[PDB]
Write a protein that binds this ligand. Structure first.
Ligand SMILES: c1ccc(-c2n[nH]cc2-c2ccnc3ccccc23)nc1
Length: 301
């Protein structure tokens, strides 16, 4: 009844997996992700993560539905969600620069979002903890009101506190190598302990903060948009190329000394460093970041 009443209108972006279309449902715009068949190894999974959990949060892409429309003629598996015109944060930051206020808004929303993803609520109608495993600029969307919501939860992993086990994801591809935390690049991570996934999620978010802050324009001064490590690795970096940079050379994205001439950038800069520790156990938690960013938010307005 759902996919059936939806009319596709335009291609909004290509996902290394599938792609997205802006559709129309009962007078409203909606985003629809259609799976390339062989890409099913993620349709059910992505549907599952968006469903099996009580993941309703203003900072997490609002899930509408999943409809098996395997065409009596061909393969059409749908994923229907809310539609955010601005698109990915990556697109956003590439096209615009931001105010100090915008920067906080963006970084706070993202943090509160992952904080909710990571939070476990044990009990009757509880909620299992969730680690994203592929947090990056391209998998975060910016809404009309200037706040973010996490997306592309296809590679996420759910922690079963009852049995302290991990509901593994059924697929044949890990995450984006450019954002892989150190313990993941050197393969020392204990993928059997859920905390490690959240810690890796954190390192990745710090990189995203770096991308946002570089675009915070004050006095007309800001840096061009650049991905983390643009100055140290080629496009589509390999594990080897990242590991030598992040693990051997112990190099992190550069923090302009000017980011200390502004309170908000001084804080963001502090959070970044505290997310990039080689030792995940020493990194800040998403809840913690939300708190400090929240406190910095009220101060600014
Ligand atoms: C169903 C439908 C789309 C998506 C989606 N995956 N990645 C980004 C979006 C997205 C989600 C919402 N609005 C957008 C707007 C522009 C570009 C991408 C998006 N996922 C499931």
């Amino acid at each position: 009844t759902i996919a059936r009443t939806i009319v596709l209108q335009e291609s909004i972006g290509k996902g290394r997996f599938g792609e997205v279309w802006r559709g129309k449902w009962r007078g409203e715009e909606v985003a629809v992700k259609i799976f390339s068949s062989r890409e099913e190894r993620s349709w059910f999974r992505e549907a599952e993560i968006y469903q099996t959990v009580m993941l309703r949060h203003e900072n997490i892409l609002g899930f509408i539905a999943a409809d098996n429309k395997d065409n009596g003629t061909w393969t059409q598996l749908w994923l229907v969600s809310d539609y955010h015109e601005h698109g990915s944060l990556f697109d956003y930051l590439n096209r615009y620069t931001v105010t100090v206020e915008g920067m906080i808004k963006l970084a706070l929303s993202t943090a509160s979002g992952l904080a909710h993803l990571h939070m476990e609520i044990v009990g009757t109608q509880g909620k299992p903890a969730i680690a994203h495993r592929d947090l990056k600029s391209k998998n975060i969307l910016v809404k009309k009101n200037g706040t973010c919501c996490i997306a592309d939860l296809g590679l996420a992993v759910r922690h079963d506190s009852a049995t302290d086990t991990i509901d593994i994801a059924p697929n044949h591809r890990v995450g984006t190598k450019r954002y892989m935390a150190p313990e993941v690049l050197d393969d020392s991570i204990n993928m059997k302990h859920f905390e490690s996934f959240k810690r890796a999620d954190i390192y990745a978010m710090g990189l995203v903060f770096w991308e946002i802050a570089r675009r915070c324009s004050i006095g007309g001064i800001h840096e061009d948009y650049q991905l983390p490590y643009y100055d140290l690795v080629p496009s589509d970096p390999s594990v080897e190329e990242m590991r030598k940079v992040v693990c051997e050379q112990k190099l992190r994205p550069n923090i302009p000394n000017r980011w200390q001439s502004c309170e908000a950038l001084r804080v963001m800069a502090k959070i970044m460093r505290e997310c990039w520790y080689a030792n995940g156990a020493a990194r800040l938690t998403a809840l913690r970041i939300k708190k400090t960013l929240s406190q910095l938010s009220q101060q600014e307005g």
